Amino acid sequence: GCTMEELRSLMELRGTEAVVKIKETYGDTEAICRRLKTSPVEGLPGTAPDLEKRKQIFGQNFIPPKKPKTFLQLVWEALQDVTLIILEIAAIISLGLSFYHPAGWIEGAAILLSVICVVLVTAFNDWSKEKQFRGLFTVVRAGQVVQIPVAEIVVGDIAQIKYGDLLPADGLFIQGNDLKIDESSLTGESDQVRKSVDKDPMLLSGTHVMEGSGRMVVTAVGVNSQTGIIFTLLGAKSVLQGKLTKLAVQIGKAGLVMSAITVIILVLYFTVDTFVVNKKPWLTEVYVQYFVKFFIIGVTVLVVAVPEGLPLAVTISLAYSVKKMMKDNNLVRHLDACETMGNATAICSDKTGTLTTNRMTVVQAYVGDVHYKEIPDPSSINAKTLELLVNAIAINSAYTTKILPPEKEGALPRQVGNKTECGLLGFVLDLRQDYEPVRSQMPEEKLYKVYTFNSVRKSMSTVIKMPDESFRMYSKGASEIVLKKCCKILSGAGEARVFRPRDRDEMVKKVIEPMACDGLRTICVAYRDFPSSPEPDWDNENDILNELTCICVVGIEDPVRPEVPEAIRKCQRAGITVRMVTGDNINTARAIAIKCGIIHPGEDFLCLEGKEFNRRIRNEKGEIEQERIDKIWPKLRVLARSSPTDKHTLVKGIIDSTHTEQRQVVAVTGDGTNDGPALKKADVGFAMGIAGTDVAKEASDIILTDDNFSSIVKAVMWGRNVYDSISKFLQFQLTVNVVAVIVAFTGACITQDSPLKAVQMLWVNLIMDTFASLALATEPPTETLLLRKPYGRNKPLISRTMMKNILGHAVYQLTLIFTLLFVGEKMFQIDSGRNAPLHSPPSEHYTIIFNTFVMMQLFNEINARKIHGERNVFDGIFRNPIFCTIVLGTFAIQIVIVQFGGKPFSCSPLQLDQWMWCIFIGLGELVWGQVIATIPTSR
Amino acid sequence: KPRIVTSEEVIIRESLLPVTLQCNLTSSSHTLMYSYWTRNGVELTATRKNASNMEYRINKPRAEDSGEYHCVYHFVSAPKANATIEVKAAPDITGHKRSENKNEGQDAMMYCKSVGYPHPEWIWRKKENGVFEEISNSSGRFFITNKENYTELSIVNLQITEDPGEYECNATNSIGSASVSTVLRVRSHLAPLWPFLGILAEIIILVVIIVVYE
């Protein structure tokens, strides 16, 4: 009958707004059942063609999962990197030319090994991330009760719902017996909702039946139900990673250009020289071995040019940082998530659970004619009053509500019953006076005239008859109802005095109004002792409900967490804008937003509900357009009555927007299932640890293990440290690759001999530099990082100070290495390694050049500790054992390589004074650093 | 005694012409079973046949080819005849050390190898003031150990004042002569002290800057 999209659009209405709609369009529910060709009393025929036709039209109740990518296919995707392709080709041609004899296979083989390293790491990272998000039976389904799997349900079914059931699909309410449902999976509020045809007939998928029984007619079944929408929006690289990939690609292509120029220059010079002077016969005998040597030199320029071990260095720095962040109660689930929050420009935050404690709590009190803005001390007031209050609340309760142990780590006690009553049950205990035996004195069997919830006045009262024949009445209820019916105020230790207007009008506007303006619900308790003849008719009560003795008035709220306001103030000083996106009504949302600091009463912002938001961002054909979101989102601060789709739409609109000229990075904090989509769409998502709702846990990037909002501040500062650490490595590594190239190029042109070999530089790029990265990652973060603005999403990555340092240090290294090349044999009184014959043994000249290069980079690891303009690069160096251990280990391995490396490394052993001169030259880099730290980068 | 007529002796020059050596068994009453060529007493490969009259050809005569060749005839019941042809070439030095670096108080060794026939005479010399002059053994430390195609000059207890220099080895025959040079360098014992002091300077400078900066 009705098309799928029609019913799906119908199922997005709640409350009385649904009821009228139905009556307008599809009459009563027994008519909409007829339109689906189903009978509420009979049920469903169960015939196979009917069932299959319905499954074809409206879909099935089953969502197929997305199979995960395999490690082999991740390796195959890792192999398709351009930087790896050029290196594989170079290694192949090197191993090829090696076997033209008319151990030269080491070099090419070494290159392959480096590739086999990088891939095996990169794939592994891509694997672990895939493994984090992997997480993302029978019901009575007929009038004639038949247990059927949930996947077999079809639109038009008649289902029966009882206590404890979890609803399998969206539907409508035919008939029942006092249904109360828990819809926290969709709204995030843990309140029981009463389902009746006149009030609210909509039943939704995934919600939990708290009380009652009934039967329903299924309307949306598969990916069209609310849980299906949530899982569709959950799917079922990074900002820094994108910047790094772009930089690596352009460095690689610069290296290719330099290698090609080297080869063509060598070939052209050879040809021109030979055919000018010799003019030998054109027989192509010699004439081949020269070309082989030219191609080997051209491959060497490429190998020294590119940073082979950059993914390894980034991975090890990020792993160290994650390990350290764990102590600040931030569980980072995958590596590349530790940086994003450093540059976030916005936070969209859930209210209940995240910014509040989600416990109904008495915050303010009016007892003894003294206002308590804070809970008083035990026995700080009349003991008779305290006993009477405790007994009143406990006995008046008379209901199944109890308080329970946390059952978890660092969790609050769990309130199982109605919220308000549990508020007072916790208040009596917060007075440091135990109530457990008082109630147990009177079992509910020894009980009398009780009217529950008193739908007339919504004020609940009881009578109790132990003390004497004079039976005692205990009544609690809303202030607006109960207050005027009271006649006595017990003030202090003194006896209760009579009051009336001007004796109750003064507390109004001095006590009640401030409480109501604090967003507090007001509940007042009263008692009577009258020895009158027993008249517990349940119909003669109106005369009884007067002359109350009002003992107190309390204020109950869901209170803000203690540390939220200061954390929000710190986050705003860092250049971040905080917005509230909640599923609760707008009054509570706005009150909590004022207390938390999100809105200051300046009245220049937007507070909206979900309906207005959805309507105002759509065209005449009812589809979302970015240009209309760009008007709402810049000044929106509170969004209330929002579904999962509204949260997802808002975060998507903020991320995609091109206004404001500063492109946005968005973080989302939440603890509920309805926050699952947005937590996934956000650049970084935070989930509350103890208050799990595990779906929010697998959707999130970071878990706050203590439910502390201040941890988010510690996540900004840590994220601004990780960034710095990587820009300490980039300054170091880019100084190596530049110098090497200018040495490998020039040496090739003039001397045609390759002063820096390929294995020599695969040791430097692969092994030495990843440990340099780990050493440079080890400074601890400080709060002074919270004093700077967020960086742009497309900032260059290489600042002006980094450029100044790279060029100023390359000048020193290049002038000294060229001095060594051209006049080094005279200074050290040795013989030259220049223009060496074919397959000649290693040299001390070129071993001194290599060892000096490595000493200069080793002492530049210390200079790379400051990326701004600070002089003192030794600040904290001796406090750090990892840095010193790594530097000494690198020194020892270099000694072993030079002394015992042999031909494979192209090293001949050096004397002691030659080592001392290498160390002298390398240590002059720390003095050149103090020279160039004087130059102001503003020039 | 069987009579063998042999070809004339040949001097290998820089010419690339092949050279053919001949042996003729002009008189023999004994039943020969075979014959073979030898160089320096070592039999050349693939040189045994009937070959009552036998020939050996060198397509690319070089200095390494020159030597004292023999053409041996082995008979059933007669002693072998080893008639000999000499192939003369100028000496060619095929081995030396480019440089010899040692510490004072140690001992140094320098050597030369050659390829020629007849085996050359060896003489060592040292460049003094532009001209090579004979080694003077006034110290008593020099130890020349000449040999047939090898020669060594060994020095014990090196002195840093006079020993460092350039030493030439000369090999001579009736045809020509070949000489190559080596460099000897002696290192001072206080060599690692000058860099070390320099390091002590650098550190001091660094300290001052930071101590003045704060």
Ligand SMILES: *[C@@H]1O[C@H](CO)[C@@H](O)[C@H](O)[C@H]1NC(C)=O
């Ligand atoms: C020596 O042997 C060669 C090669 O058989 C021959 O041509 C030549 O006539 C011989 N000479 C004499 C004198 O027999």
Ligand SMILES: *[C@@H]1O[C@H](CO)[C@@H](O)[C@H](O)[C@H]1NC(C)=O
């Ligand atoms: C070569 O053959 C001839 C003819 O039989 C014979 O007289 C002579 O002894 C042989 N020389 C050898 C086998 O060396």
Ligand SMILES: *[C@@H]1O[C@H](CO)[C@@H](O)[C@H](O)[C@H]1NC(C)=O
């Ligand atoms: C052949 O015998 C003679 C006998 O005087 C000897 O001098 C010569 O060295 C021998 N030839 C070879 C190759 O041994």
Ligand SMILES: *[C@@H]1O[C@H](CO)[C@@H](O)[C@H](O)[C@H]1NC(C)=O
């Ligand atoms: C040099 O004199 C020493 C003194 O004993 C002697 O042993 C050595 O053989 C001499 N060498 C030469 C080449 O005269």
Ligand SMILES: *[C@@H]1O[C@H](CO)[C@@H](O)[C@H](O)[C@H]1NC(C)=O
């Ligand atoms: C030099 O004489 C030695 C003596 O055994 C010999 O082994 C070596 O082959 C000779 N070298 C040359 C080039 O004649």
Ligand SMILES: *[C@@H]1O[C@H](CO)[C@@H](O)[C@H](O)[C@H]1NC(C)=O
């Ligand atoms: C030394 O060697 C040179 C070049 O080989 C040669 O000209 C000279 O005659 C030699 N000195 C002699 C043989 O005394």
Ligand code: ALF
């Ligand atoms: F109460 Al909520 F998102 F958890 F509005």
Ligand SMILES: [Mg+2]
């Ligand atoms: Mg919540």
